[PDB]
Structure 1
C-alpha cells in the first residue's frame, strides 16, 4: 500500500511512502552480507567520474542469487524483508539440508511454500524450468537469456517480461522498455511477476529526503561559471546555443548505441 502524511508542520503533507503490513524484519544473514562502501564519484585515478553525489547515510549490500545451481533439491521461503539495494524486496530461502540464500521476491508476499528447479517443475511461483515447456502468451519473470550472466531482466519493483511467440529451438520476449528480443527456448525461467510494484508512486515531499541517500543538489550549466560548464552563467535567461554535455558535445536526439554484437537478437527496437 501507499500512505500520505498529515500536515503536522510545513510541507510534510506531500510525503507518500510504500507500506506493507506483512513485510518482515530482522537481522541480515552475515555470509550473504557485505558493507560494500561508498563510491562518492571521487576517483582513484584522478578527477571525478560522476556528478550529483556526496554524503548519504550508511548502507550495506545483501547478496542475491541469479545462478540457481542447486537442482532437484526442495527449498522453503522463510521470510520476506525490506531490501536497501533493490526496490523489488528480497526473500530468505532455506534448503532441505541447511543452506540459506537470498532470492528475488516472487509474488504473494508469503513464506512457507517449497520450490524446486529442473527440466520440469511445478506451476507455482519460485519454481524454475525452460521456456520450451510453455505454450507462450504469459509472464516469464527473470530469464537466463545468456547462461554465462545468470538470470537477466526484470529485477526492480513490479517489473515483468512477456513471452510472445515460438518456433522450434527459439522464443521471443517483449520488455517494458520498448525493446523485443529472441532467445533459445531451453533458457531457464521462473514464471510469473515481481512483487512490490508501488515504488514509482513514492513522493519525497522534502528537500532533505534525497540528501540522506547521498544525492547532491543539481546546479544548471547556464548558471555556473562560463569555464566550469560549456553553457556558462548569464546573460540572464538566455541559454544562447544548442544544448551540450559538460564535455562540450551535442547529445539531444543523437543515438549512441555502437555495440553491433547483440542487434541480431533484437527483433523490435526501442524508439
Structure 2
C-alpha cells in the first residue's frame, strides 16, 4: 500500500511512503545479524571513490543466504519481515533440523507453509528445484545468472522473470532491461516471485529526508570552480562545451560497456 502525509506544519505536504500491514516489523533473528561497517565512500588507497554519501541514522544488516551449500532439506517459512537494507523485504526459513536462514520475501507473504529442496521436490512454487526439472513458461525470481554462484539477476522488488525458451542444456529468459539472456539451467532460482513492487511510488517530499538515509548534498559541476569539475562556473549562464561527468564521460548517448567475455549468453538487447 502507499500513503501521502497531510500538509499540516511546514514540510509534510509532498511526503509519500510505502506501507504494508501483512508484513512484520521489529528486530532481526540475532544469529543472522551484523552491524556491517561503512566505507565512508573511500577506499584503502586514501581517496574518494563514491559520492552523495555520509551520516544517516542507525542501521544494521540482515544476512541473506544468497550462496547455498546444500540441497534436499525440508523447511517451513517461520517469519515474513520488513528489511531497511533492501526494497524486496525478507523471510525467515526454518529447516527441520533446527536451522534458520533468511531469503527474500515471496510475493504471497504467507507464513507457516512448507517448502522442499532438491530434484525430488514437487513442481510447486518456492521449492529448490533447479531449471533442468522445471517447465518452460514458469516464473522463477533471483534467477542465478550462473549456476552455483547463488542469488543474482532479477532479485530487486516487483521481479518475477519468466522462462521463455529452451536451447538444449540451457534456458532463456526475458528482462525488463530489454535483454534476453541464456543460462546454464543447473541454476536453482527461487521458483516463484518477490513482493513489494510499490517502491517507485515513494516521494521523499523534504530536503533533509535523505540526510538521515546516509546521503550528502552534491554541487553541480558548472556551479563549482573549473579546477574540480570539467564544467566549471563562469560568468552567468556560461557553458560552451559538450556535457560531461566529473571524470570527462559524455553524459548522454556515449557508451561504456567493454566486458567482451560472455557475449554468447546475451541473445537480444534493447528488445
Which has the larger strand fraction? 1
Q: Verify the 8 A CA contact 1:86 1:155 in the aligned structure 2.
A: no
Q: Which moved more, 1:230-239 or 1:139-148?
A: 139-148
Distance of 1:64 and 1:135 partners within structure 2 = 27
Q: Which moved more, 1:243-252 or 1:6-15?
A: 243-252
Partner of 1:182: 182
Q: For residues 175-214 of structure 1, what are the structure 2 equivalents within 5 Å?
A: 175-214=175-214
Partner of 1:3: 3
Deviation at 1:75, TM superposition (A): 0.8
Q: Which moved more, 1:198-207 or 1:152-161?
A: 152-161
Cα distance change, pair 186–49 in 1 and its aligned pair in 2 (3 A): closer
Deviation at 1:247, TM superposition (A): 2.3
Deviation at 1:117, TM superposition (A): 1.3
Deviation at 1:148, TM superposition (A): 4.0
Distance of 1:237 and 1:94 partners within structure 2 = 62
TM-score by length of 1: 0.93
Cα distance change, pair 173–97 in 1 and its aligned pair in 2 (3 A): same
Deviation at 1:51, TM superposition (A): 1.4
Deviation at 1:211, TM superposition (A): 0.8
User: Number of matched residues?
Assistant: 271
Cα distance change, pair 75–148 in 1 and its aligned pair in 2 (3 A): closer
Listed one character per residue, the Cα deviations across residues 37-94 of structure 1 (whole Å, up to 9, x for unaligned) are 2222134312211112121112111110123444222111111111021111001111
Distance of 1:147 and 1:132 partners within structure 2 = 11
Distance of 1:190 and 1:148 partners within structure 2 = 13
Distance of 2:81 and 2:97 partners within structure 1 = 23
Distance of 1:141 and 1:178 partners within structure 2 = 17
Q: Which moved more, 1:195-204 or 1:5-14?
A: 5-14
Distance of 1:57 and 1:31 partners within structure 2 = 23
Q: Verify the 8 A CA contact 1:25 1:82 in the aligned structure 2.
A: yes
SS in 1 for 2:148: helix
Q: Verify the 8 A CA contact 1:160 1:175 in the aligned structure 2.
A: no
TM-score by length of 2: 0.93
Deviation at 1:34, TM superposition (A): 1.2
Deviation at 1:251, TM superposition (A): 4.8
Distance of 2:97 and 2:250 partners within structure 1 = 58
